Protein backbone atom coordinates (compact mmCIF):
# COMPACT_ATOMS: atom_id res chain seq x y z
CA UNK A 1 0.00 0.00 0.00
CA UNK A 2 2.99 2.33 0.43
CA UNK A 3 4.30 4.50 -2.40
CA UNK A 4 7.61 3.42 -3.89
CA UNK A 5 9.11 6.10 -6.11
CA UNK A 6 12.28 5.82 -8.19
CA UNK A 7 15.22 7.95 -9.23
CA UNK A 8 17.02 7.14 -12.48
CA UNK A 9 20.12 8.95 -13.74
CA UNK A 10 21.16 9.13 -17.42
CA UNK A 11 24.16 10.66 -19.12
CA UNK A 12 23.10 11.90 -22.54
CA UNK A 13 25.77 13.00 -25.01
CA UNK A 14 24.97 15.58 -27.67
CA UNK A 15 23.45 13.61 -30.57
CA UNK A 16 22.44 10.64 -28.38
CA UNK A 17 19.31 9.03 -26.92
CA UNK A 18 18.52 7.00 -23.81
CA UNK A 19 15.72 4.52 -23.17
CA UNK A 20 14.12 4.99 -19.76
CA UNK A 21 14.30 2.10 -17.28
CA UNK A 22 11.17 3.58 -15.67
CA UNK A 23 8.80 5.37 -18.03
CA UNK A 24 7.69 8.95 -17.31
CA UNK A 25 3.92 9.31 -17.00
CA UNK A 26 1.39 11.65 -15.39
CA UNK A 27 2.73 12.98 -12.08
CA UNK A 28 6.38 12.31 -12.96
CA UNK A 29 9.35 14.62 -13.55
CA UNK A 30 12.43 14.81 -15.74
CA UNK A 31 15.20 17.34 -15.19
CA UNK A 32 18.05 17.89 -17.64
CA UNK A 33 21.23 19.26 -16.02
CA UNK A 34 23.82 21.07 -18.11
CA UNK A 35 27.28 21.90 -16.74
CA UNK A 36 27.71 24.65 -19.36
CA UNK A 37 25.70 27.50 -20.89
CA UNK A 38 26.67 28.84 -24.34
CA UNK A 39 24.95 31.42 -24.69
CA UNK A 40 25.97 28.09 -31.19
CA UNK A 41 23.64 25.99 -33.33
CA UNK A 42 20.03 25.07 -32.56
CA UNK A 43 19.86 22.58 -29.67
CA UNK A 44 16.97 20.36 -28.60
CA UNK A 45 15.89 18.25 -25.65
CA UNK A 46 13.21 15.64 -26.40
CA UNK A 47 10.73 13.33 -24.65
CA UNK A 48 9.65 10.48 -26.94
CA UNK A 49 7.07 7.73 -26.70
CA UNK A 50 7.70 4.02 -27.43
CA UNK A 51 6.63 4.43 -31.07
CA UNK A 52 9.00 7.34 -31.69
CA UNK A 53 6.52 10.21 -31.38
CA UNK A 54 8.02 13.43 -30.05
CA UNK A 55 5.74 14.05 -27.07
CA UNK A 56 7.74 17.20 -26.30
CA UNK A 57 10.50 18.77 -28.41
CA UNK A 58 12.21 21.77 -26.81
CA UNK A 59 14.33 23.62 -29.36
CA UNK A 60 16.65 26.40 -28.17
CA UNK A 61 17.41 28.65 -31.14
CA UNK A 62 19.98 31.30 -30.27
CA UNK A 63 20.25 33.01 -33.68
CA UNK A 64 16.47 33.17 -34.15
CA UNK A 65 16.29 34.04 -30.42
CA UNK A 66 13.37 31.77 -29.59
CA UNK A 67 12.62 28.53 -27.74
CA UNK A 68 10.25 26.36 -29.81
CA UNK A 69 7.99 23.75 -28.19
CA UNK A 70 6.30 21.14 -30.37
CA UNK A 71 5.25 17.51 -30.85
CA UNK A 72 5.34 15.12 -33.85
CA UNK A 73 3.90 11.70 -34.63
CA UNK A 74 6.36 9.10 -35.96
CA UNK A 75 7.19 9.71 -39.63
CA UNK A 76 4.76 12.67 -39.69
CA UNK A 77 4.87 16.49 -39.93
CA UNK A 78 5.55 18.69 -36.91
CA UNK A 79 2.45 19.94 -35.12
CA UNK A 80 1.62 23.49 -33.95
CA UNK A 81 4.59 25.36 -32.48
CA UNK A 82 4.44 27.29 -29.22
CA UNK A 83 7.23 29.84 -28.91
CA UNK A 84 8.90 31.75 -26.12
CA UNK A 85 10.97 34.76 -27.21
CA UNK A 86 14.46 35.72 -25.94
CA UNK A 87 16.51 32.67 -25.02
CA UNK A 88 19.05 34.42 -22.77
CA UNK A 89 16.27 35.99 -20.68
CA UNK A 90 15.04 32.52 -19.67
CA UNK A 91 18.45 31.81 -18.10
CA UNK A 92 18.91 35.07 -16.10
CA UNK A 93 21.38 34.52 -13.24
CA UNK A 94 22.09 31.01 -14.53
CA UNK A 95 25.85 31.49 -14.51
CA UNK A 96 27.80 28.64 -16.10
CA UNK A 97 25.21 25.88 -15.75
CA UNK A 98 21.47 25.34 -16.25
CA UNK A 99 18.62 22.97 -15.57
CA UNK A 100 15.51 22.27 -17.64
CA UNK A 101 12.65 20.51 -15.81
CA UNK A 102 9.59 18.96 -17.43
CA UNK A 103 6.59 18.05 -15.24
CA UNK A 104 4.17 15.62 -16.87
CA UNK A 105 0.82 16.96 -15.68
CA UNK A 106 -1.33 14.65 -17.80
CA UNK A 107 -2.90 17.29 -20.08
CA UNK A 108 0.13 19.61 -20.08
CA UNK A 109 3.89 19.59 -19.78
CA UNK A 110 5.08 22.35 -17.46
CA UNK A 111 8.59 23.39 -18.46
CA UNK A 112 10.76 25.19 -15.92
CA UNK A 113 14.19 26.62 -16.73
CA UNK A 114 16.06 26.80 -13.43
CA UNK A 115 13.28 28.25 -11.20
CA UNK A 116 11.28 29.99 -13.97
CA UNK A 117 8.22 28.41 -15.58
CA UNK A 118 8.63 29.18 -19.28
CA UNK A 119 5.54 27.39 -20.63
CA UNK A 120 2.48 25.43 -19.65
CA UNK A 121 2.46 23.40 -22.84
CA UNK A 122 -0.89 21.94 -23.80
CA UNK A 123 -0.10 18.43 -25.03
CA UNK A 124 -0.62 17.70 -28.72
CA UNK A 125 0.21 13.99 -28.29
CA UNK A 126 -0.53 12.06 -25.11
CA UNK A 127 1.11 8.99 -23.61
CA UNK A 128 4.09 7.79 -21.64
CA UNK A 129 7.63 8.99 -22.25
CA UNK A 130 9.86 5.97 -22.86
CA UNK A 131 13.05 7.71 -24.11
CA UNK A 132 14.90 11.03 -24.03
CA UNK A 133 17.22 12.59 -26.56
CA UNK A 134 19.56 15.52 -26.99
CA UNK A 135 20.18 17.01 -30.43
CA UNK A 136 22.71 19.60 -31.58
CA UNK A 137 25.07 20.29 -34.48
CA UNK A 138 28.08 24.10 -30.95
CA UNK A 139 25.47 23.12 -28.36
CA UNK A 140 24.01 25.66 -25.90
CA UNK A 141 24.55 23.00 -23.23
CA UNK A 142 27.46 20.83 -22.03
CA UNK A 143 28.52 17.96 -24.31
CA UNK A 144 26.98 15.55 -21.77
CA UNK A 145 23.66 16.48 -20.16
CA UNK A 146 22.62 14.54 -17.05
CA UNK A 147 18.94 13.63 -17.04
CA UNK A 148 17.30 12.66 -13.78
CA UNK A 149 13.82 11.16 -13.71
CA UNK A 150 11.54 10.94 -10.70
CA UNK A 151 8.91 8.29 -11.33
CA UNK A 152 6.27 6.29 -9.46
CA UNK A 153 5.05 9.55 -7.93
CA UNK A 154 1.28 9.28 -8.59
Ligand X SMILES: CC(=O)N[C@@H]1[C@@H](O)[C@H](O[C@@H]2O[C@H](CO)[C@H](O)[C@H](O[C@H]3O[C@H](CO)[C@H](O)[C@H](O)[C@H]3NC(C)=O)[C@H]2O[C@@H]2O[C@@H](C)[C@@H](O)[C@@H](O)[C@@H]2O)[C@@H](CO)O[C@H]1O
Give the residues lining the site for ligand X (CB under 6 A). Answer: 42-44, 57, 59, 68, 70, 78, 81, 135, 137
- Cβ distance to a second copy smaller for residue 114 or 128: 114
Going by C-alpha positions, the residue among 40, 38, 41, 35 that lies closest to residue 12 is: 35
- Cβ distance to a second copy smaller for residue 7 or 92: 7
* Residue of 14, 29, 37, 125 that binds a second copy (CB under 8 A): 29
Q: Is 18 in the site for a second copy (CB under 8 A)?
A: no
- Cβ distance to a second copy smaller for residue 60 or 150: 150
Residues that bind a second copy (CB under 8 A): 2-9, 27, 29, 31, 99, 101, 103, 105-108, 110, 112, 114-115, 117, 120, 148, 150, 153
Amino acid sequence: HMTTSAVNIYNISAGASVDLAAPVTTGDIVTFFSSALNLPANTALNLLSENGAYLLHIAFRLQENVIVFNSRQPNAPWLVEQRVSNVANQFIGSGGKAMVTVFDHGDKYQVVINEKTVIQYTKQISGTTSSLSYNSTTSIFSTVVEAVTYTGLA
